[PDB]
Scaffold this active site. Structure first.
Site, short mmCIF file in Angstrom:
data_model
loop_
_atom_site.label_atom_id
_atom_site.label_comp_id
_atom_site.label_asym_id
_atom_site.label_seq_id
_atom_site.Cartn_x
_atom_site.Cartn_y
_atom_site.Cartn_z
N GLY A 194 35.89 -8.71 69.25
CA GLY A 194 37.08 -9.19 69.79
C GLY A 194 38.24 -10.32 69.99
N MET A 195 38.99 -10.90 71.03
CA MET A 195 39.64 -11.77 70.78
C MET A 195 38.23 -13.29 71.45
N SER A 233 32.44 1.17 68.61
CA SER A 233 32.54 1.29 67.38
C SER A 233 32.20 1.37 66.30
N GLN A 273 33.37 -7.82 76.92
CA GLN A 273 34.14 -6.45 76.29
C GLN A 273 35.36 -6.55 77.25
N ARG A 325 33.34 -11.72 90.02
CA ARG A 325 33.47 -12.36 89.89
C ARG A 325 33.37 -13.23 91.66
N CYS A 358 41.04 -17.91 83.73
CA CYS A 358 41.33 -18.73 82.98
C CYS A 358 42.17 -20.17 83.90
N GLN A 390 52.21 -19.75 81.75
CA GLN A 390 50.98 -18.75 81.07
C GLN A 390 51.51 -18.13 79.83
N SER A 415 48.28 -14.65 75.21
CA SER A 415 47.08 -14.88 75.15
C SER A 415 46.13 -14.46 76.05
N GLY A 416 46.84 -14.66 77.29
CA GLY A 416 46.58 -14.49 78.81
C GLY A 416 46.62 -12.52 78.89
N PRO A 439 76.36 -24.99 58.89
CA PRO A 439 76.22 -26.26 60.17
C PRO A 439 77.70 -25.59 60.45
N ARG A 471 54.27 -15.96 82.92
CA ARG A 471 54.40 -15.65 81.36
C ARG A 471 55.31 -16.39 80.87
N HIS A 529 47.13 -22.55 78.22
CA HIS A 529 48.03 -22.38 80.23
C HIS A 529 48.37 -23.95 80.33
N1 NAP Z 1 44.78 -2.63 76.18
C1 NAP Z 1 44.68 -3.89 76.58
O1 NAP Z 1 45.97 -5.11 75.91
C2 NAP Z 1 43.17 -4.61 76.89
C3 NAP Z 1 41.82 -3.68 76.26
C4 NAP Z 1 40.92 -5.19 75.80
C5 NAP Z 1 40.89 -5.76 76.72
N2 NAP Z 1 41.62 -6.08 78.02
C6 NAP Z 1 41.57 -7.30 78.64
O2 NAP Z 1 41.23 -8.61 77.69
C7 NAP Z 1 39.44 -9.40 77.98
C8 NAP Z 1 38.75 -9.08 77.00
O3 NAP Z 1 39.31 -9.87 76.80
P1 NAP Z 1 39.80 -9.86 74.65
O4 NAP Z 1 41.20 -9.78 74.90
O5 NAP Z 1 39.10 -10.26 73.92
O6 NAP Z 1 39.32 -8.54 74.33
P2 NAP Z 1 39.77 -7.71 73.13
O7 NAP Z 1 40.10 -8.23 72.09
O8 NAP Z 1 40.84 -6.12 73.69
O9 NAP Z 1 37.71 -7.30 72.44
C9 NAP Z 1 37.30 -6.12 73.61
C10 NAP Z 1 36.70 -5.19 72.16
O10 NAP Z 1 37.21 -4.18 71.95
C11 NAP Z 1 37.02 -3.58 70.84
N3 NAP Z 1 38.16 -3.90 70.11
C12 NAP Z 1 39.61 -2.66 69.22
N4 NAP Z 1 40.54 -3.04 68.50
C13 NAP Z 1 39.70 -4.21 67.86
C14 NAP Z 1 40.28 -4.86 66.93
N5 NAP Z 1 41.65 -4.90 66.05
N6 NAP Z 1 39.70 -5.94 66.66
C15 NAP Z 1 38.83 -6.51 67.37
N7 NAP Z 1 38.19 -5.45 68.15
C16 NAP Z 1 38.97 -4.91 68.34
C17 NAP Z 1 35.93 -4.94 70.09
O11 NAP Z 1 34.37 -3.68 70.55
P3 NAP Z 1 34.59 -3.65 69.47
O12 NAP Z 1 33.82 -3.66 68.31
O13 NAP Z 1 33.23 -2.01 69.76
O14 NAP Z 1 35.73 -1.87 68.53
C18 NAP Z 1 35.86 -5.62 71.24
O15 NAP Z 1 34.63 -6.07 71.67
C19 NAP Z 1 39.24 -7.87 79.65
O16 NAP Z 1 39.17 -9.57 80.98
C20 NAP Z 1 40.88 -7.39 79.59
O17 NAP Z 1 41.43 -7.67 80.72
C21 NAP Z 1 43.33 -5.88 77.48
N1 NAP Z 2 73.80 -36.29 70.62
C1 NAP Z 2 73.44 -35.22 71.48
O1 NAP Z 2 72.82 -33.96 71.26
C2 NAP Z 2 75.22 -35.60 72.13
C3 NAP Z 2 76.11 -35.08 70.99
C4 NAP Z 2 77.53 -35.29 72.25
C5 NAP Z 2 77.03 -34.54 73.44
N2 NAP Z 2 75.38 -34.40 74.11
C6 NAP Z 2 75.53 -34.34 75.75
O2 NAP Z 2 76.42 -32.75 76.30
C7 NAP Z 2 77.02 -32.80 77.34
C8 NAP Z 2 78.21 -32.18 76.09
O3 NAP Z 2 78.32 -31.21 76.31
P1 NAP Z 2 78.38 -30.17 75.17
O4 NAP Z 2 77.13 -29.81 74.93
O5 NAP Z 2 79.09 -28.95 75.49
O6 NAP Z 2 78.88 -30.95 74.15
P2 NAP Z 2 79.06 -30.98 71.93
O7 NAP Z 2 78.82 -29.23 72.14
O8 NAP Z 2 78.50 -32.18 71.57
O9 NAP Z 2 80.52 -30.74 72.39
C9 NAP Z 2 81.44 -32.45 72.62
C10 NAP Z 2 82.04 -32.75 71.52
O10 NAP Z 2 81.77 -33.36 70.45
C11 NAP Z 2 82.50 -32.78 69.38
N3 NAP Z 2 81.81 -31.82 68.36
C12 NAP Z 2 81.02 -32.27 67.14
N4 NAP Z 2 80.42 -31.25 66.41
C13 NAP Z 2 81.36 -30.11 66.77
C14 NAP Z 2 81.11 -29.08 66.10
N5 NAP Z 2 79.96 -28.30 65.62
N6 NAP Z 2 81.39 -28.09 66.89
C15 NAP Z 2 81.84 -28.26 68.19
N7 NAP Z 2 82.14 -29.35 68.79
C16 NAP Z 2 81.57 -30.63 68.06
C17 NAP Z 2 83.61 -32.00 70.02
O11 NAP Z 2 84.67 -32.64 69.89
P3 NAP Z 2 85.77 -32.48 68.52
O12 NAP Z 2 86.98 -31.11 68.60
O13 NAP Z 2 87.26 -33.51 69.19
O14 NAP Z 2 85.32 -32.94 67.61
C18 NAP Z 2 83.25 -31.42 70.89
O15 NAP Z 2 84.37 -31.55 72.22
C19 NAP Z 2 76.98 -34.16 77.42
O16 NAP Z 2 76.72 -34.03 79.00
C20 NAP Z 2 76.10 -34.90 77.07
O17 NAP Z 2 74.73 -35.11 77.58
C21 NAP Z 2 74.83 -34.82 73.41
#
Ligand code: NAP
Ligand code: NAP
Ligand code: NA
Ligand code: NA
Lengths: 370, 370
Positions: A10-11, A37, A72, A101, A134, A161, A164-165, A192, A267, A274
């Site tokens: 497994g993973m 298996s 497992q 644990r 983890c 997180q 993968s978790g 553009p 997540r 993580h």
């Molecule tokens: N339904 C789920 O998402 C599920 C299932 C299992 C585990 N888990 C969780 O994951 C943890 C276990 O670690 P893990 O993520 O490494 O488990 P895992 O990837 O599911 O592997 C565990 C076992 O599943 C079998 N397996 C089934 N399909 C597989 C595949 N396509 N590729 C490789 N092995 C496969 C393998 O056993 P064999 O070689 O004997 O076939 C492997 O040793 C547990 O703590 C549990 O909470 C969740």
């Molecule tokens: N380099 C950057 O990532 C940069 C640039 C601008 C603003 N900002 C940040 O963003 C905030 C402003 O809000 P926002 O994100 O709404 O700004 P924005 O999307 O960059 O729009 C601001 C102005 O840029 C012009 N513009 C240039 N290319 C454009 C395009 N392809 N489509 C539409 N407008 C375009 C327009 O003025 P015209 O109609 O007159 O052309 C528009 O009013 C500011 O607080 C600033 O911190 C960052």
């Protein structure tokens, strides 16, 4: 040591296998691979020939192991672990799942934070070591330096997180959703002179449409967010939000004097990292330089990102961190509320420190100390 | 009343024009349209024939107006406003730009929160009315009920800000980035047997590649986040983070006893809604039902979303809110830190209440009261 690998395909398991190959962990063990298996066909070759895939639910097979490393999941642990222990199995159970644990016989393993606790457990007969949630693990990897000095009074955590978790299929869905969004306005994007309001209108329509792929999430993630993760709990927290407090305090050995930890888990459309925005109330007014040093020196993976604009944008993001063991923390500053309020923002890979890494590291610690 | 429209063609301006058409605002005024790029050609027809586009920089043209509504931006206001006032112009200046917000002669306009302040200004000779920062306005539309009863001791705000806040080109870039991500893995997405780690590897590579469109953001937004918005300030805040405190306290008339407001402002891959996760310290322990009522009854646009999982996922999101005047707030609950800590999560459209809406509403208030 004979070690069973469950959920390797497994993973999370696949990330674990990759790391074990990279660090040559298989040189240290006799690996035994399990399946649900593909039982009975050749096991994967990660450098060593491990024979055949064994039955993950066969207690008689599992009983013969010295240790199990399982990715497992909770359902599997619930079914297998109690039966294994009841059979008199005293082996090491190393688990990614949340199931065990909070069990008194288990230690939550995050060694850069709680190595001493782990070592004490090994010495005194603990056989169950479980990776933390983890989010908890990634937070503590970032803020370990503050927590170990007992400086945190409370912490509010607002999370960002990744998909993968929730699972591999959820990640796939996120990307597919991104594709559907772009497809709907690709023509006007190429023009553009096109109106942003026309583009926006179509994007909004598309995300809301029946055809938008939402089988896994139930709602859009791409272009949106979901401020609820996991099941509801009685006090109004989600399970994800509840995990932070109980798990961190167990890791830190603070269950007798717990640090309040709460917030909203959200997540977002990130892939596998993580991120967390933290309001950290400190017990003392500590100079910012000292805070930064405490944080930076705690472990080898935390990275203090200077509170400057350009470096933050490049370093403190999922795009930078993904697939790495680095745990950057930044935006470190005192807040308007007072000089005992600290702001922090951190990012970490969910599958590494948040899942796979503590498992392989725990194996190595056990090997050295057993 | 002869009213000049500047910046009507841009993103914020276009939203304003749409709303003015919807509400038939042009029936109430003699509109005069201005331009920087199309001076001297027929003005747009939004129901009324306004003649020709006038020169936005021609002080002699602007001088003849009774009011200006400008969405042109800060650079424009800096150039034109001082010259206009120096020429003895006593007309109404209604501005989306941040330029004049903190000027003693200006009122920040958010009438569902500060109508009385606006009315007092009109009566006593205030001629400059400026829309607040999108984040501040959206927060106050959600939490007005708490702030008016003086119950907020302090508030930490961790934001999830849409691409629209950065500009129309940034929104376009976000969508293009989403397209590039999906393109890179569309084949493996269509294959159910493909590896999530293979997909992840390619997605990560693509986001990092030179060809990933990042001219506007500098870094990826799709699949990531950026925990820094606007220029750095001396104390370590970004300008976006600083705006919250000074602006909210001016709106609320609390400059003599300001509420500390701080946090981290983060850009995420949402289209045009800003979301905020709030830690709200209250001065009193107030029952949750009473808090919900206070919040719900403050204005016609705030919407209290019950703290339930499924309804939260459907209602408290950018996908739901986008292009509407609705300001949902949810996840309302007491936090682990104490019963004087309140968690809240809110979503609002950045271009409506966060930009265009206060401008047209201020026009109507002025017309009634002048
Ligand atoms: N339904 C789920 O998402 C599920 C299932 C299992 C585990 N888990 C969780 O994951 C943890 C276990 O670690 P893990 O993520 O490494 O488990 P895992 O990837 O599911 O592997 C565990 C076992 O599943 C079998 N397996 C089934 N399909 C597989 C595949 N396509 N590729 C490789 N092995 C496969 C393998 O056993 P064999 O070689 O004997 O076939 C492997 O040793 C547990 O703590 C549990 O909470 C969740
Ligand atoms: N380099 C950057 O990532 C940069 C640039 C601008 C603003 N900002 C940040 O963003 C905030 C402003 O809000 P926002 O994100 O709404 O700004 P924005 O999307 O960059 O729009 C601001 C102005 O840029 C012009 N513009 C240039 N290319 C454009 C395009 N392809 N489509 C539409 N407008 C375009 C327009 O003025 P015209 O109609 O007159 O052309 C528009 O009013 C500011 O607080 C600033 O911190 C960052
Ligand atoms: Na759907
Ligand atoms: Na680029």
């Amino acid at each position: 040591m004979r070690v069973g690998l469950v959920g390797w395909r497994g993973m999370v398991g696949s990330v674990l296998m990759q790391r074990m190959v990279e660090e040559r962990d298989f040189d240290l063990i006799e690996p035994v691979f399990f399946s649900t298996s593909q039982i009975g066909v050749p096991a994967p070759n990660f450098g060593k020939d491990a024979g055949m895939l064994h039955d993950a639910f066969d207690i008689e097979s599992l009983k013969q192991l010295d240790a199990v490393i399982t990715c497992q999941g909770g359902s599997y642990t619930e079914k297998v672990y109690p039966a294994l222990r009841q059979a008199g199995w005293k082996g090491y159970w190393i688990d990614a799942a949340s199931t065990l644990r909070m069990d008194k016989e288990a230690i939550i393993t995050l060694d850069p934070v709680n190595l001493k606790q782990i070592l004490h457990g090994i010495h005194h007969g603990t056989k169950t070591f479980v990776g933390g949630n983890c989010t908890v693990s990634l937070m503590l990897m970032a803020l370990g330096g503050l927590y170990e000095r007992g400086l945190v009074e409370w912490m509010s955590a607002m999370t960002y997180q990744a998909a993968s978790g929730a699972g591999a299929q959820n990640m796939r869905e996120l990307i597919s959703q991104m594709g559907v969004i772009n497809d709907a306005v690709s023509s006007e994007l190429a023009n553009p002179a096109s109106s942003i309001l026309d583009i926006d209108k179509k994007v909004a329509e598309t995300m809301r449409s029946g055809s938008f792929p939402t089988d896994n999430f139930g709602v859009p993630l791409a272009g949106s967010l979901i401020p609820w993760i996991d099941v509801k709990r009685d006090n109004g927290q989600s399970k994800e939000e509840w995990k932070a407090g109980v798990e961190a305090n167990k890791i830190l050995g603070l269950q007798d004097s717990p640090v309040p930890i709460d917030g909203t888990c959200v997540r977002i459309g990130a892939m596998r990292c993580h991120s967390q925005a933290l309001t950290i109330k400190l017990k003392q007014n500590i100079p910012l330089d000292e805070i930064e040093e405490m944080i930076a020196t705690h472990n080898d993976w935390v990275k203090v990102i200077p509170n400057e604009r350009d470096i933050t944008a490049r370093e403190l993001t999922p795009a930078k961190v993904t697939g790495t063991l680095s745990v950057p923390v930044g935006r470190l500053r005192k807040m308007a509320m007072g000089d005992d309020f600290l702001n922090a923002f951190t990012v970490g890979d969910q599958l590494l420190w948040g899942a796979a890494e503590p498992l392989r590291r725990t194996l190595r610690i056990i090997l050295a100390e057993k």
